[PDB]
Every structure is written in structure tokens, then in C-alpha cells.
Design an enzyme around this catalytic site. Structure first.
Site, PDB file in Angstrom:
ATOM      1  N   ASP A  73      -1.450  -5.185   9.487  1.00 41.35           N
ATOM      2  CA  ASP A  73      -2.397  -4.237   8.899  1.00 41.35           C
ATOM      3  C   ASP A  73      -3.649  -5.019   8.497  1.00 41.35           C
ATOM      4  O   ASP A  73      -3.550  -5.931   7.659  1.00 41.35           O
ATOM      5  CB  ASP A  73      -1.770  -3.491   7.709  1.00 41.35           C
ATOM      6  CG  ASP A  73      -2.727  -2.543   6.990  1.00 41.35           C
ATOM      7  OD1 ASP A  73      -3.922  -2.603   7.228  1.00 41.35           O
ATOM      8  OD2 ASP A  73      -2.285  -1.751   6.190  1.00 41.35           O
ATOM      9  N   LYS A  92     -14.038  -0.025   5.471  1.00 47.33           N
ATOM     10  CA  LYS A  92     -14.637  -0.836   4.407  1.00 47.33           C
ATOM     11  C   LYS A  92     -15.702  -1.774   4.997  1.00 47.33           C
ATOM     12  O   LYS A  92     -16.824  -1.833   4.476  1.00 47.33           O
ATOM     13  CB  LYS A  92     -13.587  -1.623   3.622  1.00 47.33           C
ATOM     14  CG  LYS A  92     -12.807  -0.797   2.608  1.00 47.33           C
ATOM     15  CD  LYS A  92     -11.705  -0.004   3.275  1.00 47.33           C
ATOM     16  CE  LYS A  92     -11.054   1.006   2.373  1.00 47.33           C
ATOM     17  NZ  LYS A  92      -9.698   1.352   2.842  1.00 47.33           N
ATOM     18  N   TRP A 126       0.826  -1.173   0.000  1.00 45.00           N
ATOM     19  CA  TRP A 126       0.000   0.000   0.000  1.00 45.00           C
ATOM     20  C   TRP A 126       0.878   1.246   0.000  1.00 45.00           C
ATOM     21  O   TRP A 126       1.827   1.347   0.763  1.00 45.00           O
ATOM     22  CB  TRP A 126      -0.966  -0.023   1.171  1.00 45.00           C
ATOM     23  CG  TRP A 126      -1.962   1.091   1.158  1.00 45.00           C
ATOM     24  CD1 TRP A 126      -2.654   1.624   0.104  1.00 45.00           C
ATOM     25  CD2 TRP A 126      -2.411   1.799   2.316  1.00 45.00           C
ATOM     26  NE1 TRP A 126      -3.457   2.646   0.520  1.00 45.00           N
ATOM     27  CE2 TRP A 126      -3.369   2.742   1.884  1.00 45.00           C
ATOM     28  CE3 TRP A 126      -2.126   1.705   3.687  1.00 45.00           C
ATOM     29  CZ2 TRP A 126      -3.990   3.623   2.767  1.00 45.00           C
ATOM     30  CZ3 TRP A 126      -2.754   2.561   4.556  1.00 45.00           C
ATOM     31  CH2 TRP A 126      -3.667   3.506   4.096  1.00 45.00           C
TER      32      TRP A 126
HETATM   33  C1  LIG Z   1      -3.984  -2.418   3.814  1.00 42.07           C
HETATM   34  C2  LIG Z   1      -4.749  -1.130   4.017  1.00 42.07           C
HETATM   35  N1  LIG Z   1      -4.804  -0.505   5.225  1.00 42.07           N
HETATM   36  C3  LIG Z   1      -5.481   0.643   5.441  1.00 42.07           C
HETATM   37  C4  LIG Z   1      -6.207   1.301   4.428  1.00 42.07           C
HETATM   38  C5  LIG Z   1      -6.920   2.621   4.717  1.00 42.07           C
HETATM   39  O1  LIG Z   1      -8.111   2.607   5.515  1.00 42.07           O
HETATM   40  P1  LIG Z   1      -8.405   3.938   6.412  1.00 42.07           P
HETATM   41  O2  LIG Z   1      -8.262   5.102   5.440  1.00 42.07           O
HETATM   42  O3  LIG Z   1      -9.790   3.816   6.982  1.00 42.07           O
HETATM   43  O4  LIG Z   1      -7.370   3.832   7.509  1.00 42.07           O
HETATM   44  C6  LIG Z   1      -6.205   0.728   3.051  1.00 42.07           C
HETATM   45  C7  LIG Z   1      -6.907   1.326   1.884  1.00 42.07           C
HETATM   46  O5  LIG Z   1      -6.869   0.763   0.794  1.00 42.07           O
HETATM   47  C8  LIG Z   1      -5.453  -0.527   2.859  1.00 42.07           C
HETATM   48  O6  LIG Z   1      -5.423  -1.098   1.632  1.00 42.07           O
END
Ligand SMILES: Cc1ncc(COP(=O)(O)O)c(C=O)c1O
Length: 390
Positions: free
Chosen positions: A208, A243, A126
Site C-alpha cells: 500500500d 495526497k 488503516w
Molecule cells: C495507507 C493508505 N492508503 C490509502 C489511503 C486512501 O487514499 P485514497 O482515498 O485516494 O485511495 C489512505 C488514507 O489515509 C492511507 O492512509
């Protein structure tokens, strides 16, 4: 930044046949954002509960939310929870949790103010992992082989080899499930080997866990996490509910911590309070409330597991109806990996100049949001399919 600026590009219409396959947000078959029913229900409960104030939550956040979030990841019958060696720190989404964790390891892990500790992230990962840890002040941010472009899947022996050659105590950022961007996760048996190397070489797992729910099954999605628990690892896990609850814009997340004894959790939590105090002071409520009420109530809980299934099923459907549609039609190769990959994000195959033309799914790598396919949005994403492929 890319994804929140391909959100601005969704407007640059040649034939008013644009496409956001860009932002990571679930989209219905009619290409709209979907507020969960459970959420619209719980929100009313909140707005019809006049007993609720808006006084400062504790620094670490709402109690009920923190319990429910950690319990969702580790399971109701986890030995960690039962031995009271688990803490949780309400955060501003997964990005919040990550940063807070990054800041803590920078200040308290592998000695004091140790920015020299090697941080390891999947190749690729990411876009935001590198940046989050750079901000927390780590100088050495390294890749571990993961995406084997040739075999279009997990490079296990490269991964392991890299963990084998990592200096003892190095931090390792792991996708708990729904790897982003590629969409290939390890099997449990693949996890078991990785853990083994991490155990021998004392590597720190930082999970994560942004897409718990998206095999469609929450207990299944948490197996890797819960295995590390049972093998006696200590670790962090950055949970996001953006999500799986559709609470993108209430910034709901949680940094769960697993320790060897309760006293560690107490020490660790107390030092997190300082960090939170100088980052956002304390967390926002509406998000955490909506989740806390959903998971703590069996009735609502069940309905929520349905709503995550719903999203999880439509993603599979959109997967099938484009891979399987490469059995009759062809041009270059064919290929299984669309319906092989899981999560919200697919890694297609493409080069950087196809991506420029294309229609416009402009993630240069070739990563698409599967939820962004619809029947109307033509299951025929590339329209004829192999005119920009041929
Ligand atoms: C592995 C991972 N962690 C975290 C996030 C972000 O979520 P948030 O913006 O609610 O922390 C994403 C978004 O694609 C992701 O792919």
C-alpha cells in the site's frame, strides 16, 4: 468510516476553537486545502486542448498514466520494467487498487476461489484494510505486531516472529512508506530482514503506497518497493495520488503488478478486466490525464517534485515546533517520538478519555494529522499542552 464522519463533527464548536486533526488531507499554515500549482497549470492545458474527447478509456485505463504511475514506484531503471514483467491497472484511488487486488487474489491466488488464505495487516493499520479484504470475501484477516506502545515504535522482532509463524503463501499488506496511523516506517535494514522472512516462507507482499513523496523524496520513499523488486519478489502495489498530487476527489490510483515473466502479467491483466468490468466498467479520465501529463513532461515533472517537497517540509516544521517545545515546558515525561515519526499522521500517546475531552482531535487511538497544526491554529495544539495531559 470514522474519518469521513469526524469531517461532519468539524462544526461541533464549544469555543469556536474546533479542530479537524481528522481527515487525511494536507492543510496549509492558514488551514485551507491546497491545490498544487502544477495541477492548476495542467488542468488549463487540458481545458485548452480541444482535441480531447470523452470516449470510453480502456477498462484497465489510460496507457500513459499507467506507465508513468508504475514507473514512479519502481524507478525508471527497474529490472522489472526492462524485462517487461510489470503491469498496471488505473484504479479509483488506493482504495480502488486495493479492492481490485483483493478481488483478484480471492479469485486467482493460492488456487482458485481461495477465501481461506490468511491476510495479514499491521497492528494497528488503516481502518479500511480489514474492510476492503472482507468485502473481497477473505474470512481470516490477522494482525502482525508493529506498534510497541511501551517503546513507542516498531516491534521488529514481534513483526518478524509473526511473519515466521504465518502459513506459507499468506498475503501480507505492507505500508510502502508513511505508516498509517502510527507514522513509524522500517529502516531499509529493517526491510531487508522482513523480506528475508517473506522470501523463505513464500509470503505474498501486497504493498500500500498512498503517500509516495511524504521523506519529501520520491526515490527515497520507494526504496522498500524497489528492494523487493531487486530481491526477485512478485507482488502488487496499490498506488494512490490523492495526497502527492492533491487529487483526492478525482480518485486517481493504480494497481501495479510485478511478475516472474511477461506471460504472467498478460494472464493477470486480462483477468483484472473482468473484475473492473463488473466494479466500475472503466476509470474516470480527468484524474489520470492530469497525472499522465505531469510525469511524462520533464518541465512539469520537476516543478511537481518541488510541490511535494513544499508539503513535506511544512509537515516537518509543524513536527519540530511542538516536540522541541517539550524541552523547556513539561508535565508527563517529555518525548522524542513526534519528530521521530514520519508521514502525515502522528501517534501521540493518549488514552480514550483524554480523546473524548480533546482540543477535539477525536481519533480515539490518539492519531493526529500533523498537517492540521498551524502557528495560528496555535502550534499550542493542547494550548497550555498538559492540562488535558498533566
Ligand atoms: C495507507 C493508505 N492508503 C490509502 C489511503 C486512501 O487514499 P485514497 O482515498 O485516494 O485511495 C489512505 C488514507 O489515509 C492511507 O492512509
Amino acid at each position: 468510516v470514522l474519518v469521513f464522519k469526524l469531517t461532519a463533527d468539524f462544526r461541533e464548536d464549544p469555543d469556536p476553537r474546533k479542530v479537524n486533526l481528522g481527515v487525511g488531507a494536507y492543510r496549509t499554515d492558514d488551514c485551507h486545502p491546497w491545490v498544487l500549482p502544477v495541477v492548476k497549470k495542467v488542468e488549463q492545458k487540458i481545458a485548452n486542448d480541444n482535441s480531447l474527447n470523452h470516449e470510453y478509456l480502456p477498462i484497465l485505463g489510460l496507457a500513459e498514466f499507467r506507465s508513468c504511475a508504475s514507473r514512479l514506484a519502481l524507478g525508471d531503471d527497474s529490472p522489472a520494467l526492462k524485462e517487461k514483467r510489470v503491469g498496471g491497472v488505473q484504479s479509483l484511488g488506493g482504495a480502488g487498487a486495493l479492492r481490485i487486488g483483493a478481488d483478484f487474489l480471492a479469485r486467482w491466488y493460492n488456487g482458485t476461489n481461495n477465501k481461506n488464505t490468511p491476510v495479514y495487516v499491521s497492528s494497528p493499520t488503516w481502518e479500511n484494510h480489514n474492510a476492503v479484504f472482507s468485502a473481497a470475501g477473505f474470512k481470516d484477516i490477522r494482525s502482525y505486531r508493529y506498534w510497541d506502545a511501551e517503546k513507542r515504535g516498531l516491534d521488529l522482532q514481534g513483526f518478524l516472529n509473526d511473519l515466521e509463524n504465518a502459513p506459507e503463501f499468506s498475503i501480507v499488506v505492507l505500508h510502502a512508506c508513511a505508516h498509517n496511523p502510527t507514522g513509524i516506517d522500517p529502516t531499509p535494514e529493517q526491510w531487508k530482514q522482513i523480506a528475508s522472512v517473506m522470501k523463505h516462507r513464500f509470503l505474498f507482499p501486497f504493498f500500500d503506497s498512498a503517500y509516495q513523496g511524504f521523506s519529501g523524496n520520491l526515490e527515497r520513499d520507494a526504496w522498500a518497493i524497489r528492494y523487493f523488486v531487486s530481491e526477485g519478489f512478485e507482488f502488487f502495489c496499490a498506488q494512490s495520488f490523492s495526497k502527492n498530487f492533491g487529487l483526492y476527489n478525482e480518485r486517481v490510483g493504480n494497481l501495479t503488478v510485478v511478475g516472474k515473466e511477461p506471460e504472467s502479467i498478460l494472464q493477470v491483466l486480462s483477468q483484472m478486466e473482468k473484475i473492473v468490468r463488473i466494479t466500475w466498467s472503466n476509470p474516470p479520465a480527468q484524474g489520470a490525464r492530469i497525472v499522465a501529463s505531469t510525469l511524462s513532461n520533464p518541465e512539469l515533472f520537476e516543478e511537481w517534485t518541488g510541490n511535494v517537497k513544499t508539503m513535506a517540509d511544512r509537515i516537518l516544521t509543524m513536527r519540530s515546533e511542538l516536540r522541541a517545545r517539550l524541552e523547556a515546558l513539561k508535565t508527563p515525561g517529555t518525548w522524542n517520538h513526534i519528530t521521530d515519526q514520519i508521514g502525515m499522521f502522528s501517534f501521540t500517546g493518549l488514552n480514550p478519555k483524554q480523546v473524548e475531552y480533546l482540543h477535539i482531535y477525536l481519533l480515539p487511538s490518539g492519531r493526529i494529522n500533523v498537517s492540521g497544526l498551524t502557528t495560528k491554529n496555535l502550534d499550542y495544539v493542547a494550548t497550555s499542552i498538559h492540562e488535558a495531559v498533566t
